[PDB]
Design a binder for this molecule. Structure first.
Ligand SMILES: CCCCCCC/C=C\CCCCCC(=O)OC[C@@H](O)CO
Ligand SMILES: CCCCCCC/C=C\CCCCCC(=O)OC[C@@H](O)CO
Ligand SMILES: CCCCCCC/C=C\CCCCCC(=O)OC[C@@H](O)CO
Ligand SMILES: CCCCCCC/C=C\CCCCCC(=O)OC[C@@H](O)CO
Ligand SMILES: CCCCCCC/C=C\CCCCCC(=O)OC[C@@H](O)CO
Ligand SMILES: CCCCCCC/C=C\CCCCCC(=O)OC[C@@H](O)CO
Ligand SMILES: CCCCCCC/C=C\CCCCCC(=O)OC[C@@H](O)CO
Ligand SMILES: CCCCCCC/C=C\CCCCCC(=O)OC[C@@H](O)CO
Ligand SMILES: CCCCCCC/C=C\CCCCCC(=O)OC[C@@H](O)CO
Ligand SMILES: CCCCCCC/C=C\CCCCCC(=O)OC[C@@H](O)CO
Ligand SMILES: CCCCCCC/C=C\CCCCCC(=O)OC[C@@H](O)CO
Ligand SMILES: CCCCCCC/C=C\CCCCCC(=O)OC[C@@H](O)CO
Ligand SMILES: CCCCCCC/C=C\CCCCCC(=O)OC[C@@H](O)CO
Length: 475
């Protein structure tokens, strides 16, 4: 019968829903940094550009960290389908706040709404995609491959459309276009989900038991009281600046995997065999952190280079952000044929982590060339950025599909659900690491910034190549 490229027609609803949410999110990311530059130039925002770059990095870090909790909220409390809807309302509200005739006072309110909203939506839309296929359906992998296609599709047209609207009608209209994009998504999701989505997912599939309610309430209350207490003593000591808070969220985002790691490597009930699998995974987790740190600097550091060091007079600078989802859509049909046809001697999944990290380092090493040859005073060809993005995404084609499968294969049965978080949390730690590194990038440190962090990523990819045989053997 009639399908959506061979899959049930319910996929088209979740295709549209996530395409328009990625449209709203990445359409905002393409102009949010430049919007902060504008507020700084008018004296309305009293921070430096290095701090504004840190905000962008720690913003993304909290979004991924929020994406590790929304799955628990839906599957236990509110339900997957209500989490996508109300998550989308919070995202729409976040963009509406920026569309209002406000300035810097609306930045923190808008950021919180999108952080909470994205955590409810992104994990539970992927969850609803799986619910379209009863088990044994081998169309599942092809359906998710089409789902991620709409993800990249929305991330591609958003910087082009939203960036052009900013040049024509200003920032407030451009931010309203992002809110409208989320509005189109909730329209197709609400009315489309009422026809093809299973009504069982209107409630939590694993609701709380009566004896589970009180301990969960105590657990979330102690974490809030402690986090509030940490903020209290900061202002008393005097560490009450915006870089001080960003450092706090940097520490709490990095301590979560560090505490989870020390919590896992120390337990006795795991015995020796599965204990080495956790130790051997540490070189893999740190490599994912370094890659996602480089990949997420495209919307921060590379966006700064595009506006200041590239002669892009005939088009909006924010259009460079479309290069990241463009190469993904171009690389996917090639790598889809590659991994299946390469039956002879396909490299191990740890090696793909190493080569993926080396290519992310080659992307930054490439960016050090124009500043060393021409200097940092003038403008260079826009082809330097399209070559940098081409390299870092080649590293993503090797790391992103293999990444989650690596953590699951090395995960002991007692750490499985927690090990899965370690993979998703590597994106939050990479952006948390960026919140400190992007401050070092400026006009006079361009060549050094790209050289040291680029070579350091290449060297650490060489080290993983050596350690690849030992880690694959444990699998
Ligand atoms: C506006 C009133 C709120 C409606 C909330 C509906 C909702 O929970 O979304 C789930 C959606 O899949 C219903 O088909
Ligand atoms: C929670 C994540 C917030 C990251 C920091 C963003 C922020 O505080 O921006 C506020 C800035 O406009 C100071 O006026
Ligand atoms: C449910 C619909 C949600 C979408 C709401 C869309 C809101 C429409 C318009 C408000 C934003 C445009 C206001 C433009 C403005 O005030 O600044 C003037 C202009 O020069 C700057 O762009
Ligand atoms: C997402 C809604 C806000 C949740 C904030 C976090 C507060 C912590 C736990 C939520 C309170 C528990 C509500 C669920 C509940 O009472 O279920 C009871 C029933 O299912 C079993 O007796
Ligand atoms: C947990 C404590 C984390 C403290 C984070 C470091 C800090 O706040 O110092 C910032 C300092 O530069 C004040 O301007
Ligand atoms: C606990 C692990 C903390 C790792 C150190 C870190 O995340 O950065 C600290 C830095 O922000 C202090 O200014
Ligand atoms: C674990 C690897 C994290 C990378 C640490 C790093 O590159 O720091 C660079 C240093 O110059 C920061 O000041
Ligand atoms: C599948 C693996 C892909 C690897 C691609 C490797 C590409 C090799 C060389 C690209 C040129 C290296 C950068 C040097 C360069 O572009 O300088 C040219 C510049 O001086 C022109 O004015
Ligand atoms: C592809 C191979 C690229 C390898 C090295 C590129 C070096 C770029 C030019 C070196 C350079 O700028 O020299 C710096 C110094 O001479 C300036 O006074
Ligand atoms: C892809 C292939 C990329 C290979 C590029 C490798 C190295 C290029 C960086 C050259 C660093 C030159 C340098 O640091 O000295 C220039 C200095 O005078 C500017 O501060
Ligand atoms: C596959 C991806 C391979 C891409 C690797 C390197 C491409 C960098 C080349 C960009 C530098 C360049 O060609 O500038 C020349 C420019 O003056 C021509 O308009
Ligand atoms: C081929 C695989 C990786 C490219 C080789 C990296 C070369 C390292 C490099 O030239 O960096 C030099 C730079 O640190 C000078 O300050
Ligand atoms: C961007 C992803 C992080 C990759 C870092 C890999 C860790 C290995 C080496 C890091 C370079 C250490 C020296 C860096 C440094 O001197 O900091 C200042 C530098 O930015 C000069 O402007």
């Amino acid at each position: 019968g009639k399908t959506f490229f061979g899959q049930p027609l319910g996929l088209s609803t979740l295709f549209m829903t996530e395409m328009w949410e990625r449209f709203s999110y990445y359409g905002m990311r393409a102009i949010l940094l430049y919007y902060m530059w504008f507020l700084i130039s008018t004296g309305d925002l009293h921070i430096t550009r290095a701090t504004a770059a840190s905000i962008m990095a720690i913003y993304a870090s909290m979004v991924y960290l929020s994406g590790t909790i929304g799955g628990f909220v839906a599957d236990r409390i509110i339900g997957a389908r209500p989490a996508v809807f109300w998550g989308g309302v919070l995202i729409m509200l976040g963009h509406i706040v920026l569309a209002l005739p406000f300035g810097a006072s609306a930045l923190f309110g808008s950021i919180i709404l999108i952080i909470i909203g994205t955590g409810f939506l992104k994990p539970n839309v992927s969850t609803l995609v799986g619910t379209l296929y009863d088990e044994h359906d081998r169309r599942r992998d092809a359906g998710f491959s089409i789902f991620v296609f709409g993800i990249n599709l929305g991330a591609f047209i958003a910087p082009l459309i939203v960036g052009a609207a900013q040049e024509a009608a200003g920032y407030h209209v451009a931010f309203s276009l992002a809110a409208i994009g989320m509005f189109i998504g909730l329209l197709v999701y609400y009315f489309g989900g009422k026809k093809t989505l299973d009504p069982h997912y209107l409630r939590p599939t694993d609701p709380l038991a009566p004896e589970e309610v009180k301990p969960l309430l105590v657990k979330v209350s102690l974490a809030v009281a402690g986090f509030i207490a940490i903020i209290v003593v900061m202002n008393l000591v005097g560490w009450n600046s915006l870089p001080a808070y960003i450092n706090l969220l940097t520490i709490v985002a990095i301590a979560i995997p560090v505490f989870y790691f020390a919590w896992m490597i120390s337990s006795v009930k795991v015995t020796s065999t599965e204990h080495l699998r956790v130790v051997s995974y540490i070189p893999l987790f740190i490599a994912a952190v370094l890659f996602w740190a480089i990949e997420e600097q495209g919307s921060v550091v590379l966006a700064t280079f595009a506006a200041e060091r590239v002669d892009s007079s005939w088009f909006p600078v924010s259009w460079f952000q479309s290069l990241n989802p463009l190469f993904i859509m171009l690389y996917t049909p090639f790598f889809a044929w590659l991994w299946t046809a390469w039956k002879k001697n396909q490299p191990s999944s740890p090696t793909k982590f190493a080569v993926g990290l080396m290519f992310a380092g080659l992307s930054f090493l490439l960016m050090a060339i124009p500043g060393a040859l021409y200097g940092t005073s003038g403008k260079v060809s826009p082809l330097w950025l399209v070559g940098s993005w081409a390299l870092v995404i080649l590293g993503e084609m090797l790391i992103s599909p293999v990444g989650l499968s690596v953590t699951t294969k090395l995960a002991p049965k007692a750490f499985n659900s927690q090990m899965m978080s370690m993979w998703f949390l590597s994106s939050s730690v990479g952006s948390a690491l960026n919140a400190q590194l992007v401050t070092l990038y400026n006009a006079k440190s361009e060549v050094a910034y790209f050289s040291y962090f680029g070579l350091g990523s290449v060297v650490l990819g060489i080290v993983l190549v050596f350690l690849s045989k030992r880690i694959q053997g444990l699998m």
